[PDB]
Amino acid sequence: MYKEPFGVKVDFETGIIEGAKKSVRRLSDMEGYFVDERAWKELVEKEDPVVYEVYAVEQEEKEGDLNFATTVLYPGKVGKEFFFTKGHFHAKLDRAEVYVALKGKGGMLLQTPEGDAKWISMEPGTVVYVPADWAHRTVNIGDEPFIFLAIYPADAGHDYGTIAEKGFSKIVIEENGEVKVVDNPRWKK
Amino acid sequence: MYKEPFGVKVDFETGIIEGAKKSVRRLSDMEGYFVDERAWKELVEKEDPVVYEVYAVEQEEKEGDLNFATTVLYPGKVGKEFFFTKGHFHAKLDRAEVYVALKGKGGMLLQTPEGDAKWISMEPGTVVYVPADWAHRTVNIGDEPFIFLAIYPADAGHDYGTIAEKGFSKIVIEENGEVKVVDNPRWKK
Ligand SMILES: [Mn+2]
Ligand SMILES: [Mn+2]
């Protein structure tokens, strides 16, 4: 009749949830995502660094139920562009999400279906409300891993497809040790 | 047109979310909740301590949306019984909840509508999954404030009344400076 309640441990310093489902994304998994494709290729052949890892505790896709996951987003740049998660829209556009920043320095880039953009800086303790209808990506703007916990409806779904093709209308770069949020040159949509 | 995304800061050491709606619950707000009623009256009339504070960031009661709140559960006892939150079932039964422990030592007592209870220990970094259909209450079993963040569907609602009259089937006590989960001596059914 009833699902079993349970506890798991999250290590706030490493992001690891022991016995969660671990996904690893290396740079080679992100062709077409970064603006500087020649820088992408070089770094892929040279080293192919891990860009991010995810530790996810997911339920069966059910309305009213919740999933949670940590992400460890590693520091680095592709050309001038900081490492980031691929980003997605939810499959059901009526699903919100909550992020809680745990370690390091980063931010969230969000985008409406039109291309209207929003940046929210994230340091430890920051809680971000991700509303329905917004595509979302996190960005590591520091020198150490950026670690966060996300809590999201079990039936939210993921649409990675649109972002893979279009990308975000903004990019986050470093020029001169200054972090800048600027127009995506490759934005024609 | 769109709901605005936003970030708020949570201070992990205090539980404070500046810009949240703050709620304070004192012992006098919890008449009939504790087993030792004489100890309850004496403490109300001698001190009326703060039992817990909540900082809540809530949305409209809409499908797919999410609320979040921190709670600061203060240390203490009423007779042998540790300080706890009032507890509730959700008013919509099939709505789950995720709790993240941040500071101190505590735990969650959960119970089905059939009266079967479960206890999950919570130390900093513990994430607790509260499934649909379970009433839930947090308990501070240490000498420091127990601080946690909860994320819950915006339309889960609350049913406080049921617990107000019944209580939980188990209580959490100190006997020999040792934490025990024992039967609620008032439990008939
Ligand atoms: Mn998401
Ligand atoms: Mn609840």
Side-chain angles (χ1 to χ4, degrees):
Chain A
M1 269 201 163
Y2 304 111
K3 269 170 74 169
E4 186 95 346
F6 63 87
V8 298
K9 175 76 164 43
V10 176
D11 186 330
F12 281 13
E13 307 280 0
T14 66
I16 299 173
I17 306 169
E18 278 201 293
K21 169 178 136 300
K22 177 171 172 185
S23 297
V24 178
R25 296 295 178 269
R26 319 185 72 93
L27 201 53
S28 52
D29 301 309
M30 313 178 65
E31 200 171 354
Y33 278 85
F34 292 91
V35 166
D36 195 333
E37 296 204 44
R38 293 186 192 83
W40 178 82
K41 178 132 182 153
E42 177 177 27
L43 203 41
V44 171
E45 291 177 328
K46 214 162 61 198
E47 185 198 342
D48 193 24
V50 175
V51 181
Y52 62 103
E53 300 172 312
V54 182
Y55 294 90
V57 176
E58 300 196 303
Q59 307 303 315
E60 204 157 27
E61 304 186 51
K62 183 187 170 185
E63 183 176 349
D65 214 342
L66 303 169
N67 294 351
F68 63 89
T70 51
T71 297
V72 187
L73 180 53
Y74 293 95
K77 295 193 301 217
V78 180
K80 296 154 47 165
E81 187 172 17
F82 287 112
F83 278 12
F84 55 56
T85 61
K86 282 182 177 190
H88 54 263
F89 268 111
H90 292 148
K92 307 197 182 184
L93 277 183
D94 224 61
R95 295 312 189 244
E97 188 164 0
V98 175
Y99 281 62
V100 186
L102 302 183
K103 195 181 184 186
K105 198 175 195 182
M108 186 169 306
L109 195 65
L110 303 100
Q111 184 166 298
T112 61
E114 319 181 28
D116 316 298
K118 170 81 158 177
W119 170 260
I120 297 183
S121 77
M122 292 171 67
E123 52 171 30
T126 302
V127 175
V128 183
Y129 174 77
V130 182
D133 295 305
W134 290 81
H136 47 282
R137 161 182 289 172
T138 53
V139 180
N140 185 341
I141 64 165
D143 294 303
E144 77 162 320
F146 172 54
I147 301 176
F148 55 87
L149 176 62
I151 299 84
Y152 53 109
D155 75 342
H158 284 74
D159 171 45
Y160 285 97
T162 300
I163 303 302
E165 295 291 1
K166 308 189 182 180
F168 280 71
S169 61
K170 303 289 180 178
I171 54 168
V172 181
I173 59 171
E174 200 173 18
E175 299 213 79
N176 302 130
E178 183 184 18
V179 182
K180 295 188 191 168
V181 178
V182 300
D183 291 329
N184 187 343
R186 278 130 171 251
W187 195 252
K188 63 166 297 179
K189 203 320 166 60
Chain B
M1 189 138 187
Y2 292 104
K3 205 160 168 174
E4 192 153 68
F6 63 88
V8 298
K9 259 151 257 201
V10 177
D11 181 345
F12 287 167
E13 316 277 344
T14 68
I16 300 161
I17 307 167
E18 278 166 27
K21 185 180 167 174
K22 186 181 177 174
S23 286
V24 179
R25 296 291 178 273
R26 305 194 83 112
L27 212 54
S28 60
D29 297 304
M30 302 180 70
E31 195 200 46
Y33 278 76
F34 295 88
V35 172
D36 190 342
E37 268 155 45
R38 302 193 47 155
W40 177 87
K41 193 93 167 309
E42 205 207 51
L43 200 56
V44 165
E45 301 173 345
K46 277 181 180 190
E47 191 194 337
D48 199 22
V50 173
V51 177
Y52 61 105
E53 304 170 302
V54 176
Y55 300 83
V57 178
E58 294 188 326
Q59 303 307 316
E60 202 161 321
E61 283 175 281
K62 213 101 72 174
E63 278 178 67
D65 218 333
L66 292 170
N67 297 345
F68 63 92
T70 51
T71 297
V72 182
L73 185 52
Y74 288 97
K77 276 188 282 151
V78 180
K80 305 174 170 187
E81 200 169 17
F82 290 109
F83 274 20
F84 52 60
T85 61
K86 281 183 178 188
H88 57 243
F89 280 100
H90 294 152
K92 283 202 206 311
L93 277 175
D94 63 355
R95 256 56 178 159
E97 189 159 1
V98 171
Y99 278 62
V100 188
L102 301 173
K103 192 97 167 284
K105 182 149 188 173
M108 197 187 290
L109 192 61
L110 303 97
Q111 172 174 294
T112 63
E114 303 180 340
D116 298 310
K118 180 155 205 192
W119 167 260
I120 308 305
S121 284
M122 293 171 77
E123 55 169 17
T126 299
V127 173
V128 175
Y129 172 81
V130 183
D133 286 323
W134 292 78
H136 42 283
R137 150 178 295 171
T138 43
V139 176
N140 182 341
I141 59 166
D143 295 337
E144 295 178 70
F146 178 53
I147 309 177
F148 57 88
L149 170 67
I151 296 98
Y152 50 107
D155 67 341
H158 305 275
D159 175 19
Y160 290 103
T162 301
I163 305 301
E165 50 209 343
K166 300 213 227 292
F168 283 67
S169 58
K170 310 227 176 285
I171 65 171
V172 187
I173 63 159
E174 191 184 71
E175 219 170 30
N176 307 127
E178 193 179 33
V179 186
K180 286 166 184 163
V181 181
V182 304
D183 288 343
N184 187 349
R186 77 152 66 114
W187 206 249
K188 35 168 167 47
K189 296 177 69 81

